[PDB]
Amino acid sequence: TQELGANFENFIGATEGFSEIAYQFTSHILTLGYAVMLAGLLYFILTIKNVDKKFQMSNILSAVVMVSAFLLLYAQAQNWTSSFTFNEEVGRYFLDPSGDLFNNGYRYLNWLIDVPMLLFQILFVVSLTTSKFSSVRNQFWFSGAMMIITGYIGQFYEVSNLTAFLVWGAISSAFFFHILWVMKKVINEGKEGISPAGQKILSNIWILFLISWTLYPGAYLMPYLTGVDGFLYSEDGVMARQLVYTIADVSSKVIYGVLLFNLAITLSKN
Template sequence: MVSAFLELWRLAQDWRYAFTFSDGLWRPVNDAFSNGFRYVNWSIDVPILLIQLVVVLGLTRKSAISYATKFTIGGLLMIWTGYIGQFYEVTDPIPFWIWGAVSTVFYVYVLFVVWGLISKESDNLPKSPDNLPGMMRFVRSYLFITWTLYPIAYIIPAFWFDGWGVVTRQIIYTVADVTSKVIYGVILGYIARKRSEAIDYEPAMATSRR
């Protein structure tokens, strides 16, 4: 979540200096605004956030390594192929759509693995307190909904060419980042804490050293 906040702060700074107010209008300056920081951040956050599912579900070592590998490779390929495509979003629509389609294949693959993992393992979580299996199934649906915002934002330049299209794309990306990282992390952290309580782990306590 820390990296998500840093990413959003940096993007806000870049967005602020990408325009200047002149003659009653905000006009772009010479340096173009870049989504590069988003892709760098996604390359860090997406594997970590998905691997957190593996940790919270308490998989065996062999299964944990298998799923972590799938999430890391699938997630990075999804991000990097999409990043290649966005270089062509203005200049050449054909490579944009090709790389976007390749990225979508990995996007569907990752969500398919997430769905299968949670469907298979959620019932192994303690049912008391707070019906943790039900909460984990909510996380499954929540990820599908929030992740859907990314491909919507990705294809906006192909249909919406003016300044409002650019602004709308950044708003959707930002909402997606907050919901699929920060809020997702809070929900998963709550499930992890309740799971620890159910199996009699003591909460961490800060102690002073003398």
């Protein structure tokens, strides 16, 4: 029984270890992750004047999301390099007992913080019609919290109890589904009473939102998407998962933010 090796990254690291490629690739993608958030932070701060007052809370929330994402993704990247160490004899990177072990906590904390802000921020750009701001907000914040919390519980069982992993994941997915349903309503109401240029941007926001948020349960499942014998149940799963999380992060935070900013501009003077 493999004592050292919590989560799938540790498990792989403690058994098969990571190739140079896999270790370096993962380091670099996580580094790109936080680098982009820092760039984003400066972007959202510096452009805030370019939208009308009434929209500025959206740019503000983007900036705050960028701060949290930069800090926690920076910590996650450091946690990656600290957790695995090169063995010359075998020529691979293994879980380092004198390190702290890989910890998904950083990313899940980032999600808990950012999910409510990302869902919230669209409400400061669009106008609802027949829905109440407070109802939509409360729905977003509750479902968002529950989605991440149940996900985080699931994640614990990733190695040790796949049944629990998947059941908690399914419960989490239910909250996710509900978020998608609410957000679709928000975008539809948001499209009413605005210019076609604005409607087009909102169509794109919907598509970006749907794809980028769905990447997360994708990445959660990733090591198992070819069965317990398959090619992804390996350092290849770890690489894929971290790549997909990073793409999702950039898309759901930065690209999302840029589209909302462009929507606010389109509404702002035009």
